[PDB]
Design a protein around this ligand. Structure first.
Ligand SMILES: Nc1ncnc2c1ncn2[C@@H]1O[C@H](CO)[C@@H](O)[C@H]1OP(=O)(O)S
Length: 208
């Protein structure tokens, strides 16, 4: 039997709507914020409406990917699929904790903090991940720029989590209704939610 395109936690319709709108509000507020406007030259090289900037968005249900498999063509795919914990967890319900919303010149996303139980489902094959605890890459993609490729959001999140690793977040340059707004430079932005969002999701496989 051939594997799916990827395994992951697929949010319920309820949660998807909640997270998508939250993400949407973040883009609208961020783009309207003075601290962001005066940094536009570090974001693009040419007022920017971020909702349109991130034109490529998930068509429907949002998800948090664990392992990209490419129907078995991806390295370590077969080995990930064969694990008991994956076959056992298939179809099960989980609660994912969203800790922050972030934006870079390439992607917009939400940071997921996995529990130890959920970390069991994280693959164990990057230089970015160096220093950060496994699963730091976990995320939900909300949108990307026109010519941005898959897997970029995870790479973007890791990079941001490296800046914070060196206590270089800088003071919050503003307050939004949901939390503190941080400017990380090079077009990178992070909203650390005051209260973590919880989303219900089902762990399963997507076959395209
Ligand atoms: N190496 C990869 N190549 C393509 N997609 C990947 C890869 N790693 C993780 N993904 C993810 O698999 C899903 C389908 O592309 C998407 O969720 C990709 O992740 P994102 O960072 O959200 S674009």
């Amino acid at each position: 039997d051939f594997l799916p395109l990827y395994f992951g936690w697929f949010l319920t319709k309820k949660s998807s709507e909640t997270l998508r709108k939250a993400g949407q509000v973040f883009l609208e507020e961020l783009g309207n914020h003075k601290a962001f406007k005066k940094e536009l030259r570090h974001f693009i090289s040419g007022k920017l409406e971020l909702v349109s900037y991130f034109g490529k968005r998930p068509p429907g249900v949002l998800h948090c990917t664990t392992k990209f498999c490419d129907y078995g063509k991806a390295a370590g795919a077969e080995e990930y699929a064969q694990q008991e914990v994956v076959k056992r967890s298939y179809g099960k319900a989980f609660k994912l904790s969203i800790s922050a919303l972030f934006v870079t010149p390439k992607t917009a996303g939400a940071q997921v903090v996995l529990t130890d139980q959920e970390l069991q489902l994280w693959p164990s094959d990057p230089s970015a991940s160096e220093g950060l605890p496994p699963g730091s890459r976990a995320h939900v993609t909300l949108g990307c720029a026109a010519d941005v490729q898959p897997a970029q959001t995870g790479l973007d999140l890791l990079d941001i989590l490296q800046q914070v690793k060196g206590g270089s977040q800088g003071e919050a340059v503003g307050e939004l209704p949901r939390g503190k707004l941080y400017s990380l430079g090079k077009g990178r932005w992070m909203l650390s939610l005051t209260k973590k969002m919880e989303v219900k999701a089902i762990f399963t496989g997507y076959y395209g």
